[PDB]
Paper text:
Class X myosin has been found to be localized at the tips of filopodia, which are plasma membrane protrusions containing bundled actin that are necessary for cellular processes such as cell adhesion, migration, angiogenesis and the formation of cell–cell contacts. Myosin X is required for filopodia formation and extension. Myosin motors move along actin filaments via a series of conformational changes in the motor domain that are coupled with the sequential release of MgATP hydrolysis products, Pi and MgADP. These conformational changes in the motor domain are amplified by the myosin lever arm, which is comprized of the C-terminal subdomain of the motor domain (known as the converter) and an extended alpha helix length that varies with the myosin class12.
Given the surprising large step size that we measured for the myosin X dimers, we next evaluated whether the motor domain was capable of generating a larger angular swing than myosin V. We had previously shown that myosin VI has an unusual rearrangement of its converter domain in its pre-powerstoke state (PPS). This state in fact corresponds to the structure populated by myosin upon its re-attachment to the filament with a primed (pre-stroke) position for its lever arm. We thus crystallized the motor domain of myosin X in the pre-powerstroke state (with ADP vanadate bound) at 1.8 Å resolution, as well as that of the MD2IQ of myosin X at 3.1 Å resolution. The PPS structure differs in the orientation and position of the converter as compared with other plus-end myosins. Comparison of these PPS structures show that while the subdomains of the motor are totally conserved in position among the myosin PPS structures obtained to date, the myosin X converter is rotated compared with that of myosin Vc and other myosins. This is not due to a conformational change within the converter as found in myosin VI27. Instead, a sharper turn at the end of the SH1 helix, (at Gly672), allows formation of specific interactions between the converter and the Nter subdomain in particular with class-specific loops of this subdomain.
Residue numbers in the entry: 3 to 598, 607 to 741
Write the structure that this text describes.
Amino acid sequence: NFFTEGTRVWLRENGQHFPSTVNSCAEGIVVFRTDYGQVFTYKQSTITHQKVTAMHPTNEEGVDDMASLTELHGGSIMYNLFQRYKRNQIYTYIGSILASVNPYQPIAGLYEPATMEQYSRRHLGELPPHIFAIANECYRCLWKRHDNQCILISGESGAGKTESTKLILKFLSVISQQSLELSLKEKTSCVERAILESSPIMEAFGNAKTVYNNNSSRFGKFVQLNICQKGNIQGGRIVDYLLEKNRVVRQNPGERNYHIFYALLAGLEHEEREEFYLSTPENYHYLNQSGCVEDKTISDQESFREVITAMDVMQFSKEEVREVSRLLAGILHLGNIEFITAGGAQVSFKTALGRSAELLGLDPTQLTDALTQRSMFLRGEEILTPLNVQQAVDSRDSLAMALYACCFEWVIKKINSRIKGNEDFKSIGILDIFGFENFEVNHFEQFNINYANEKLQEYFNKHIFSLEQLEYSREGLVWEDIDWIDNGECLDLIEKKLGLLALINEESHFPQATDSTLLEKLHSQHANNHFYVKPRVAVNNFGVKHYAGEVQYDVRGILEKNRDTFRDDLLNLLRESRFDFIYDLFEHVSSRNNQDRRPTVSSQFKDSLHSLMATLSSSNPFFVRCIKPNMQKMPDQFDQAVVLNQLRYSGMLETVRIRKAGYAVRRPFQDFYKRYKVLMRNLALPEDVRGKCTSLLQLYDASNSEWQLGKTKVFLRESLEQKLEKRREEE
Ligand SMILES: Nc1ncnc2c1ncn2[C@@H]1O[C@H](COP(=O)(O)OP(=O)(O)O)[C@@H](O)[C@H]1O
Ligand code: BEF
Ligand SMILES: [Mg+2]
């Protein structure tokens, strides 16, 4: 096991194989330097085989498809991504699955229109791996397959899911324009322009700075593009999931509120700024509590200009844009209302109340009364009761959240109205969720986000491993099952009867229950569950062993957040608005007054995720796995421990194994024969269809290792299908 200076070796250390070089070998000491800059020293006598092994020559600053790898260990997989990342190749295939490592910098030529053009005219595998090749293959599947397609993008907060989604949309929008024979109706619709302009609007209203991402998505998005038989986008539909409405009124230290507030304050002209009584973001409680009002990566004034342009494309009138500006200004002033205790909560600093009442079209005495008192009618006289200061603050904040959430819903409705079109043929759906996040302090918001990420990982495992191997078994293929990391029991802990969501919902329906009584119930029921953590010291927390790591959640605020109560006194007040825009938002809204069962945030979200997964189940999926190379948002900094952790927990190692050994493409015998009949013209074919399929497959892969015949289908590897598709097009 002796290797001379400069020899390339795999060094087994710290539970992995390190790509390394022999630095020195003298006086019975051997020093290895890893490609990651770690230096490991040993007594030469202690080095044996398997501990140190020679590395396979070159093979050669990486491989494009990791199913091509001979060494399948985590060290080999990560080294391939590292070699490629160092030369700005952030994309690697695993069959048709795409790995994307966030470069945290622009890369010359990578997303230029000349590159988009090049990918549109090639087959998957002909060019270097790229998100444009996946978008193109997905698009080609609308004529190669019989179903709708979907692209699902996974990753922690900051991994690159939102950037990936926008790149796919830009590529499809460009390709939609290449389509023939483009009618004047379809050329003048500007529907692709509107679809692309939906992103700056939704990011301004739904994204915010967090520790993991200066542009974190605080809602989930599913974008459906309806494509005609001729290949042109006819229109689309956007579905939003669980906006983080509590961000409007409170943020963690160092975070910001939604981008749009800072854009509005930096972007409005002096006249409109004075009309809405607006000053700097520091002047507003809803924007100043976190201690951060700016970020060097964001020009808030430039974002405002971008939002204005996008809203014009989206057919928001100039008056509608002003109404949205006025509502946001009203919310900012509302947040500055302070209360003192005399009775009874009383408004202290009356200026903010007067400004907010004017901007919201409310009478100031009516707004003061609604925030400081509760009303009830008893056959048939009104009985006014004082609220305390915490109840007045909760009322002020619920008003701010309701205004923002209804305004966001209206914005999404307007986008959907603009991009609405025919659905005559097929669709491509793209899922952009909020990513996995584990902060210093996690609340109900992180619980819901991490649950959605857990659900998406279960969806990835179901398609890549579970349904895939079940199909091989049902078809009678020669196959040895590949084990995978199954997160099913974590979802069972969250979703089953007596599970986390069930207990949270049950406690929410009890008026006397508190976050403290909820925690006692969570601990009592689940202390022995392997996926649940009862903290030894942190008295306000519970933990969940998520697929992406253990997360501790502070229970404080869970019941109030889950109930999501809105006082009928405030709903009645909003309906008094003289500002038609505000009245229109609350005109037909259902009552959510405290009860003395109504859907909760958890019950509606569980239903929305189950409905989403059902939509995705009917489509053919493409998977993109975004990987963060480091936790410092740095370019050219591949932190191997951070990368390896994501590769391992996400099941990338087993994914390479199943894509390498398995057969991801399948067609019934007659379907295969009818599709590729042109490629069989020089073959002496037998009478039976199974024999006809075998003759073509043996011609294109004589090793007989890239395909198998099942009971009803031909099964083949993606590399063989790409080889057959390229030749079919040529003929
Ligand atoms: N492909 C990319 N090229 C360059 N920078 C990128 C790329 N993907 C992401 N980034 C950088 O990382 C940041 C976070 O990416 P984003 O897509 O918002 O993450 P996620 O949606 O997964 O939370 C971006 O705002 C940008 O600075
Ligand atoms: F912060 Be990312 F949108 F997950
Ligand atoms: Mg995002």
